[PDB]
Amino acid sequence: MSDLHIPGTQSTPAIQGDWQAGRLSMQGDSYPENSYELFGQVIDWVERFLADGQRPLELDLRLLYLNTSSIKAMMDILDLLEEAHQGGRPVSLRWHYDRRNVAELAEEFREDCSFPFAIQA
Numbered sequence: 001m002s003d004l005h006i007p008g009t010q011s012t013p014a015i016q017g018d019w020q021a022g023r024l025s026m027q028g029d030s031y032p033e034n035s036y037e038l039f040g041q042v043i044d045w046v047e048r049f050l051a052d053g054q055r056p057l058e059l060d061l062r063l064l065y066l067n068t069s070s071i072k073a074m075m076d077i078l079d080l081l082e083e084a085h086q087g088g089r090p091v092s093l094r095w096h097y098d099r100r101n102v103a104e105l106a107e108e109f110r111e112d113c114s115f116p117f118a119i120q121a
Contacts (some may be wrong), residue, residue, distance in 0.1 A: 012038055013063060022055050025118040028030040032096045035069035043104070046080050056090035057081070063095075066105070078113055085115040092116045 003041040004017030004024070013028035024046065032038050049057055059081070066074065081091045092115065099121040110117045 004042060006069070007083070015042060019049070022049065022057045023060060024057065025060045029065040030070035031064065031065060031067040035073045039073035043076060043080070046077060050084050050089065052078060053117060054089070058091070059092070059093040061095045078109060082113055094118045094120055096120050
């Protein structure tokens with residue numbers, strides 16, 4: 001029932017799981033030593049949201065740099081959305097990027113998802 005609220009730092013992104021709205025948001029860089037210490041709780045929150053109802057879940061991402069381990073973590077998150085989508089769950093995603101920076105990783109992630117995935121400049 002509670003929200004997920006991880007304050008951002010230099011090396012880890014600010015993360016907001018809004019439970020009432022069904023929004024999961026992430027902002028900043030991710031290069032922690034231990035990505036699953038950071039992301040495990042985010043993965044559980046998504047599972048709990050998905051187990052609970054039929055309510056839509058949307059991701060709104062403003063991520064910049066992602067280390068190897070955080071890529072694997074994000075894909076584990078995408079996999080849960082994919083599997084929920086396959087079962088008829090409304091899931092959507094928006095990947096925001098500044099174009100003075102082309103968004104090749106996001107396209108690689110988009111290629112692995114059947115649900116709506118927008119890459120926005």
